[PDB]
């Protein structure tokens, strides 16, 4: 509930005690029930397997990636998202990766990831079409909907409130050094207006 | 006049006629 991507319940055997250990993975696309998932340094490069980032070749597509070895997955967890392995630095062992936002990150080569892309992709391509569907979407996430515009408020309620016309009145780009109660609008905006041209600055 | 530019001017004129006809009802 509240998550775009489906979850996979993978049952492992406890290596030190006779019992079963169930894990809640984020299902990668193509993973099916009854499938054998192999997790570890020596696992094969198959979709759904959990491998350290250093053990996979350049160009590999991984998901649920650990920022640090052992944090059990931090990156590329939302539906349809993935991390691209773009290179390795075996001396001072590190892996260069491309994050879903397009940022290039250097991660420890012992950090683990799941081979494949998170399931549920293309979810945001369908128009919600209804306040009701937005209502039920956020009914299981948090009380962040609906959103009243600040310009529609009174000056007491918001920096944008008040005026004989609904207007901001001053620049909506707010400094990063501003304080709580001031950071309404575009916080630390490097630019504004419609984005024209190429992204992914380098 | 160039045939191409006469065609362009006529196309703009039809666009204007369509707009005015849509305005009218």
């Amino acid at each position: 509930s509240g998550r775009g991507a489906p979850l996979a319940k993978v049952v492992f055997r406890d290596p030190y005690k006779y019992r079963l250990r169930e894990e809640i993975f984020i299902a990668n696309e193509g993973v099916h029930t009854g499938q054998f998932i192999y997790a570890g340094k020596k696992a094969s490069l198959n979709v759904g397997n959990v491998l350290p980032l250093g053990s996979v070749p350049e160009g590999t597509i991984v998901s649920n990636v650990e920022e640090k070895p052992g944090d059990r997955g931090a990156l590329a967890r939302a539906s349809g998202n993935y991390v691209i392995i773009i290179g390795h630095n075996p001396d001072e062992n590190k892996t260069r990766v491309r994050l879903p936002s397009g940022a290039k990150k250097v991660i420890s080569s012992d950090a683990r990831g799941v081979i494949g892309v998170i399931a549920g992709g293309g979810r945001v391509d369908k128009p919600l079409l209804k306040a009701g569907r937005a209502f039920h979407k956020y009914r299981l996430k948090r009380n962040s909907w609906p959103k009243t515009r600040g310009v529609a408020m009174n000056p007491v309620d918001h920096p944008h409130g008040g005026g004989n016309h609904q207007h901001i009145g001053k620049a909506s780009t707010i400094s990063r050094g501003a304080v709580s109660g001031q950071k309404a609008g575009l916080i630390a905006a490097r630019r504004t207006g419609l984005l024209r041209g190429s992204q992914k600055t380098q | 006049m160039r045939a191409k530019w006469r065609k362009k001017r006529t196309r703009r004129l039809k666009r204007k006629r369509r707009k005015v006809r849509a305005r009218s009802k």
Binding site: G4, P6, N28, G30, T33, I61, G122, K126, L129 | -
Partner: protein, 91 residues
């Protein structure tokens, strides 16, 4: 007979929400309500549960997929590229 000329499944929305939004919803609704071939038993019995879950009515096998279709093009590309990388690593 053909009950609707073009709206199809999106006739349930009447005249609301805009024609472009209704068409965008129509494509993906057809995709998500279609039946798909089971890769395991070979029957056209795979239907969506929640988004990303695709279950075969016969053989009761469930596969992770796209939100509105069994396999997205990105996932197919990833599968082929991992096949290639695995084959290069093993040989």
């Amino acid at each position: 007979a053909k009950r609707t000329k073009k709206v199809g499944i999106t006739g349930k929305y009447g005249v609301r929400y805009g024609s472009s939004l209704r068409r965008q919803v129509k494509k993906l609704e057809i995709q998500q309500h279609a039946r798909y071939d089971c890769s395991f038993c070979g029957k056209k019995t795979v239907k969506r549960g929640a988004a990303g879950i695709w279950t075969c009515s016969c053989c009761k096998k469930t596969v992770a997929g796209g939100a509105y279709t069994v396999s997205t093009a990105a996932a197919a590309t990833v599968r082929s590229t991992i096949r290639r990388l695995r084959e290069m690593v093993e040989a």
